[PDB]
Amino acid sequence: DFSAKVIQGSLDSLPQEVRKFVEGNAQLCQPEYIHICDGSEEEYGRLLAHMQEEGVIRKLKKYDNCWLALTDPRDVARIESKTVIITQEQRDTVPIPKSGQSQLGRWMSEEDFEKAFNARFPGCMKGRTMYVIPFSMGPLGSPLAKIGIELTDSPYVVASMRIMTRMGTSVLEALGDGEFIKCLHSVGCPLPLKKPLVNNWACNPELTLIAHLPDRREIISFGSGYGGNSLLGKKCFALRIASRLAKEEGWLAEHMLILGITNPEGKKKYLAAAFPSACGKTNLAMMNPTLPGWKVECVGDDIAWMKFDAQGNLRAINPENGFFGVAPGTSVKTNPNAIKTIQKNTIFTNVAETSDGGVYWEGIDEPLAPGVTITSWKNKEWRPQDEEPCAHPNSRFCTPASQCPIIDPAWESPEGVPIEGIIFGGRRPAGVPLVYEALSWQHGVFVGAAMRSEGGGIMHDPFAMRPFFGYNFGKYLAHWLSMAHRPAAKLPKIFHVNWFRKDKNGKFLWPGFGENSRVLEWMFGRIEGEDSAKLTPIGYVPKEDALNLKGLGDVNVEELFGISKEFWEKEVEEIDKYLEDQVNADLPYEIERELRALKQRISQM
Ligand SMILES: Nc1nc2c(ncn2[C@@H]2O[C@H](COP(=O)(O)OP(=O)(O)O)[C@@H](O)[C@H]2O)c(=O)[nH]1
Ligand SMILES: [Mn+2]
Ligand SMILES: [Mn+2]
Ligand code: NA
């Protein structure tokens, strides 16, 4: 009985299964205190002041209630190589690659995991508070929501989870005796410290391990206090566990922004889009459209949970409550809506601080007044001449979603928004035109599966889900393809975009950002069934003169929309080899058929 150690809440008022979870882990981890989070303002404010008291965070004096955490430089990112999924059979988690190295997941056996777990968690919270975070992924009480309980020894996790999910007493009330996902986290530095603390940032890099056990509905994460490793909604629950539930239950859990776009006629449609990190989800979800009379509103910028309703509409929710955005490259010029969102009640991690207590980072494109100086994320004086960036490249803002000036009115509607188009895209400097439309659902799924993006080399990132599949990618393709056999299903039109095509000198061919409204306008019209497409071997592209290019006189249209037989032969052979090596016996017939159909179309150029 751990009652004597509860410093907020009551073990007696927790649902029986929740209590079991907490007490079992209190006995294992040996926390000094147990704090059952209520999610209140008062709780939050004091937690912040305490972290400030301890030097774990700094208040940024230039803003209303903004904070800065600077990490141990060993703990700056989600770490794929220490991220695993446990299942009885390896093939259920990942396909077996012919090369002996899967790019599509990282399986761990139950046996190896039990040894790892036992080498880490016993006594790991000694002399710390175990916080109990009851959270909802999705609007509270939504039929599409799922509930988690995170145990953590990190107040930084609590504060960030209050932003990134819906947490507190109301969730425990909603939960009752329902099922929930068990989320267990420790920074893995029990007191007294065995190793020196760096930058007031508790972590255990050598023992970092982020595990998922979908068959037990557990997420178990050790040694990192950072982002996707420690905020267990966000990638572990909302993509990895959730994609497996989705497969079981007949829905989709995806790495997609969700936006609502209204045309000048006042007609509105929702679109979802899957792009990998650094390929523009935040920019698109919060776009300030350049086209007069168009409006974009943000439902979410990262995760979409989608389920066909009784009427066959594909209904999407954003299961998050906030934006955990990469800060560098965010500028007033490029992304004014994100700039407005983050000016209050935001936690920043590993950005630079100006001497007047403000935030700074690469690509902020805000000149500073003469005399204003910069402290880098490594707590050193820094000047724009310097070899190193002032902010870590993976540094973040963590901001409440409700503060986005263009947040959609239906962003928390419990039944979700009806999705009429799904967009795929990444960074392709060559070959791939600005926009194309898939010929069918099956072709659209192949376009998803074929996605590549230049991020530290050109690499495959199918559906923008490479680091996030909860189970075998081949089976995930079959799941997508199965949506076509749902009677009365209204399947979204699928498009592929490329904002990032360059000429031989390395110059972007398309201005992008707000100008992408011109491409959305074409998509909108296409969903309306307008005759604005020309057929090409890779799918439909805009007709000559179909795009509104008024205001953009010097756009190399020939190169931006060019399709080269030579490029596309190479592209299909590379896709064929990748699918063969990485997916093989688990590749659905229809994906193989689409690949052969594409090859044939190109052969006839
Ligand atoms: N050239 C160009 N860059 C873009 C565009 N959209 C976003 N970016 C840049 O890509 C980087 C990451 O963008 P962001 O929207 O944060 O991407 P996310 O990581 O997918 O959410 C930033 O430097 C952006 O300024 C675009 O349409 N064109
Ligand atoms: Mn993401
Ligand atoms: Mn983002
Ligand atoms: Na710090």
UniProtKB/Swiss-Prot annotation:
Catalytic activity: oxaloacetate + GTP = phosphoenolpyruvate + GDP + CO2; L-seryl-[protein] + GTP = O-phospho-L-seryl-[protein] + GDP + H(+)
Gene Ontology BP annotations: cellular hyperosmotic response; cellular hyperosmotic salinity response; cellular hypotonic response; cellular hypotonic salinity response; cellular response to cAMP; cellular response to dexamethasone stimulus; cellular response to fructose stimulus; cellular response to glucagon stimulus
Residues that, per the record, bind substrate: R78, Y226, G227, G228, S277, N394, S395, R396
Location of the region described as Omega-loop in the Swiss-Prot/TrEMBL record: 448-470
Record text on activity regulation: Phosphoenolpyruvate carboxykinase activity is regulated by acetylation and glucose levels. High glucose concentrations favor PCK1 anaplerotic activity by triggering acetylation on Lys-82 (K91ac). At low glucose levels, SIRT1-mediated deacetylation of Lys-82 promotes the cataplerotic conversion of oxaloacetate to phosphoenolpyruvate. Phosphoenolpyruvate carboxykinase activity is inhibited by 3-mercaptopicolinate.
One term of GO molecular function: GDP binding
The record's account of how the chain is modified after translation: Acetylated. Lysine acetylation by p300/EP300 is increased on high glucose conditions and promotes ubiquitination by UBR5; acetylation is enhanced in the presence of BAG6. Deacetylated by SIRT2. Deacetylation of Lys-82 is carried out by SIRT1 and depends on PCK1 phosphorylation levels.
Involved pathway(s): Carbohydrate biosynthesis; gluconeogenesis
Localization, UniProt: Cytoplasm, Cytosol; Endoplasmic reticulum
Residues the record lists as binding GTP: A278, C279, G280, K281, T282, N283, R396, R427, F513, G514, E515, N516
Family (UniProt): Belongs to the phosphoenolpyruvate carboxykinase [GTP] family.
Subunit structure: Monomer.
NCBIfam families membership: PRK04210.1
Official protein name in the record: Phosphoenolpyruvate carboxykinase, cytosolic [GTP]
